[PDB]
Structure formats: structure tokens, C-alpha cells
């Protein structure tokens, strides 16, 4: 019937969770516990940023993390059932993980800060770029992005629904690319406020590095399926899952697919299990009987947990 769905970069705020922390402690007592493993207050870091700062992958990611987890917490500590499926946008693949029992979570939250840096390292700041292409279909955008190239690195990277695409890769080549694409037929490329061209070739280096801490923490048998954006395949060999994380570095994230795949699943429901209202926006986009919602704050989450 239902899954649980989980955000990652964009949907940071500076404030984020603030309500739910009142009206339940358990937020608190995780960002403490995360805290506590990067070694510095991360509860702070969101709740007074600054942004420029919470904004900057290798805190984002861990912060982002934290949340979730945060409130998949408060879902079970009030006797919400488990979900039938979750799947986890980037970032949100770990927290899925995490939720889903796979990766335990201080191990997680140092994971996501190391693959921050691996990142943030692979490409120097201002040599990158993604955009948003709004209302073109996939193929014009891989021929669009294919003729942009021209020597350098662009492609399409997140699939997050029909007429929404995101891509990335040298800053120059996105340029060439969203012209490209607007010449091609579409609405919007809008440009993308991020260092970090993920999911494409150019994190290739990144992932390599990943890889071999990836290969230092125990991946247990999830709990409950989850998707993953790569191949959307509901992998349960951890060394699968690590396999697949390794490669959601340098691959197109598959959401469109893996939102259909949860549908042709069975699932009616996806609820946000993070800040912000993303994964919720794009839902209808991609099969609009399905309906969704977000689970970050007291009303919703008291609401929610009635059914
Ligand atoms: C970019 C963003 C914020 C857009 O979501 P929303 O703002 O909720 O989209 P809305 O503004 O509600 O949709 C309407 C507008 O978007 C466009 N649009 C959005 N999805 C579309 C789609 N699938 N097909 C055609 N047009 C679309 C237009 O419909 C446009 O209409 P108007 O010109 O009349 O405003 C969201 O998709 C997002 O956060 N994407 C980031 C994903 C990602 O890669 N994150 C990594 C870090 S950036």
C-alpha cells in the first residue's frame, strides 16, 4: 500500500524539522548521536546555518541523513507500521538503507560526509554545473546532451520525472546542452545553485574512493525492499547494495523508473520521510493516481499515523 521515499540535496533548509523537534525529543537525541560521530553540532548547523554553509554536500549530506532517520524514528516510536517499499532520491538511498535497517547509523553518517568530500574533491568548484531541463522527453535531452559534448562531460543525471530531467558534467558542456535543448523544444533549462555535477561520468573518481570505505562497514540484509537508483533493482547481497552505491556515483539516478516500479508494485501511497516537499511534487508527475505526502511535520505526522 504505501512506501517511504527519501530526499537529498535541494532539500536542506536552514529551520528544517524545527517543529517536529518540539513536539518530539527523538529528533534531538538523533542529531546528538550524529553529532557526536562527525564531532560537531549538526542539530546547530541546521537550525542557524548559516545556508552557504549547510549547503556544502559533505554537511548536507549527513545533515539530510539525520533527518530522515530522524523521523522514520518518530514513525515507529508512535507504532507506524512499516512500509511496503522505500526508495530514497541520491542521497535518500542511504537514509532508505539506514531506515531499512542495512547500514547502521553512525557508520551512515560518517559514510555520507566522507562521500561529501570524495566528492566535493573529484571537481573543483566552478568547473561544474547541473541544470534542470523543464518539458522535453528523455531522448531529445541524451541527443541534446550527446552534441553538446564536444570533448567534454554532459548528460543527463537525475530522472525525476516526465519533463523533469536533470543534467550535469564540465560547466561549458551543460551550457551547450541546455541551449541544446531549448532549441529542441523545451519549456526550461533552469540552472541548478550546485558545486557538485553528481551522477555523472566525472564522479567516476569519487566512487573508487567510495568504494573502499564502502567496503569497511557491514551491509546487512534489508529489512524491508528497497529500490535503488541505479539500477532499480531491489538488491538484498549487501555486497549488491555497496555495489550499487558505488555506482549511483557516476550513473543517472533512475527516479521516474523506480516511482513506476513501486506502482507497478502495488504501492498507492509514497510519503516524504524528510524535509521538504520534492519527492511529493514529482509523484503525480509520474503516475498521478498515485498520491503523496510528506512526512516532516506534527499534524501530517500525527495524521498520517491515524490510518
Ligand atoms: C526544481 C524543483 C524545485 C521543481 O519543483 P516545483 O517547483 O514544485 O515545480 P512547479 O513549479 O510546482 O511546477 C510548475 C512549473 O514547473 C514546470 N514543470 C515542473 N515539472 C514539469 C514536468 N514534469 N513537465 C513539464 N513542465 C514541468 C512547469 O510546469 C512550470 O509551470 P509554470 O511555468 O506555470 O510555473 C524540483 O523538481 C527539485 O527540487 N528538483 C531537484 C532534483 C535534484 O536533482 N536535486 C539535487 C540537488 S539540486
Same mark, same amino acid.
Given at each position: 500500500?504505501?512506501?517511504?521515499?527519501?530526499?537529498?540535496?535541494?532539500?536542506?533548509?536552514?529551520?528544517?524539522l524545527?517543529?517536529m523537534a518540539?513536539?518530539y525529543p527523538i529528533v534531538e537525541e538523533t542529531f546528538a548521536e550524529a553529532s557526536a560521530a562527525?564531532?560537531?553540532d549538526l542539530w546547530?548547523?541546521?537550525?542557524?546555518?548559516?545556508?552557504?554553509?549547510?549547503?556544502?554536500?559533505?554537511?548536507?549530506?549527513?545533515?539530510?541523513?539525520t533527518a530522515?532517520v530522524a523521523l522514520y524514528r518518530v514513525?515507529q516510536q508512535?507504532?507506524?507500521?512499516?512500509?511496503?517499499?522505500?526508495?530514497?532520491?541520491?542521497?535518500?538511498?542511504?537514509?532508505?538503507?539506514?531506515?531499512?535497517?542495512?547500514?547502521?547509523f553512525a557508520?551512515?553518517?560518517?559514510?555520507?560526509?566522507?562521500?561529501?568530500?570524495?566528492?566535493?574533491?573529484?571537481?573543483?568548484?566552478?568547473?561544474?554545473?547541473?541544470?534542470?531541463?523543464?518539458?522535453?522527453?528523455?531522448?531529445?535531452?541524451?541527443?541534446?546532451?550527446?552534441?553538446?559534448?564536444?570533448? /567534454?562531460? #554532459?548528460?543527463?543525471?537525475?530522472?525525476?520525472? +516526465? $519533463?523533469? &530531467?536533470?543534467?550535469?558534467?564540465? =560547466?561549458?558542456? @551543460?551550457?551547450?546542452?541546455?541551449?541544446?535543448?531549448?532549441?529542441?523544444?523545451?519549456?526550461?533549462?533552469?540552472?541548478?545553485?550546485?558545486?557538485?555535477?553528481?551522477?555523472?561520468?566525472?564522479?567516476?573518481?569519487?566512487?573508487?574512493?567510495?568504494?573502499?570505505?564502502?567496503?569497511?562497514?557491514?551491509?546487512?540484509?534489508?529489512?524491508?525492499?528497497?529500490?535503488?537508483?541505479?539500477?532499480?533493482?531491489?538488491?538484498?547481497?549487501?555486497?549488491?547494495?555497496?555495489?550499487?552505491?558505488?555506482?549511483?556515483?557516476?550513473?543517472?539516478?533512475?527516479?521516474?523508473?523506480?516511482?513506476?516500479?513501486?506502482?507497478? /508494485?502495488? #504501492?498507492?501511497?509514497?510519503?516524504?520521510?524528510? +524535509? $521538504?516537499? &520534492?519527492?511529493?511534487?514529482?509523484? =503525480?508527475?509520474? @503516475?498521478?493516481?498515485?498520491?503523496?505526502?510528506?512526512?516532516?511535520?506534527?499534524?501530517?505526522?500525527?495524521?498520517?499515523?491515524?490510518?
Amino acid at each position: 500500500q504505501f512506501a517511504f521515499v527519501f530526499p537529498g540535496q535541494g532539500s536542506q533548509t536552514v529551520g528544517m524539522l524545527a517543529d517536529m523537534a518540539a513536539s518530539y525529543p527523538i529528533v534531538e537525541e538523533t542529531f546528538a548521536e550524529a553529532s557526536a560521530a562527525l564531532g560537531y553540532d549538526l542539530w546547530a548547523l541546521t537550525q542557524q546555518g548559516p545556508a552557504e554553509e549547510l549547503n556544502k554536500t559533505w554537511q548536507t549530506q549527513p545533515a539530510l541523513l539525520t533527518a530522515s532517520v530522524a523521523l522514520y524514528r518518530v514513525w515507529q516510536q508512535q507504532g507506524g507500521k512499516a512500509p511496503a517499499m522505500m526508495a530514497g532520491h541520491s542521497l535518500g538511498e542511504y537514509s532508505a538503507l539506514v531506515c531499512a535497517g542495512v547500514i547502521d547509523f553512525a557508520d551512515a553518517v560518517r559514510l555520507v560526509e566522507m562521500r561529501g568530500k570524495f566528492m566535493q574533491e573529484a571537481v573543483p568548484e566552478g568547473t561544474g554545473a547541473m541544470a534542470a531541463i523543464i518539458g522535453l522527453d528523455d531522448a531529445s535531452i541524451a541527443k541534446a546532451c550527446e552534441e553538446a559534448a564536444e570533448g /567534454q562531460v #554532459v548528460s543527463p543525471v537525475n530522472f525525476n520525472s +516526465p $519533463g523533469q &530531467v536533470v543534467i550535469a558534467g564540465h =560547466k561549458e558542456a @551543460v551550457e551547450r546542452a541546455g541551449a541544446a535543448c531549448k532549441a529542441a523544444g523545451a519549456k526550461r533549462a533552469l540552472p541548478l545553485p550546485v558545486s557538485v555535477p553528481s551522477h555523472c561520468a566525472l564522479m567516476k573518481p569519487a566512487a573508487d574512493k567510495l568504494a573502499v570505505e564502502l567496503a569497511k562497514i557491514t551491509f546487512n540484509a534489508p529489512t524491508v525492499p528497497v529500490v535503488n537508483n541505479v539500477d532499480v533493482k531491489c538488491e538484498t547481497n549487501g555486497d549488491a547494495i555497496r555495489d550499487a552505491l558505488v555506482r549511483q556515483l557516476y550513473n543517472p539516478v533512475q527516479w521516474t523508473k523506480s516511482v513506476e516500479y513501486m506502482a507497478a /508494485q502495488g #504501492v498507492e501511497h509514497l510519503y516524504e520521510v524528510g +524535509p $521538504g516537499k &520534492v519527492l511529493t511534487g514529482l509523484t =503525480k508527475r509520474i @503516475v498521478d493516481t498515485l498520491t503523496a505526502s510528506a512526512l516532516n511535520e506534527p499534524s501530517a505526522m500525527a495524521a498520517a499515523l491515524e490510518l
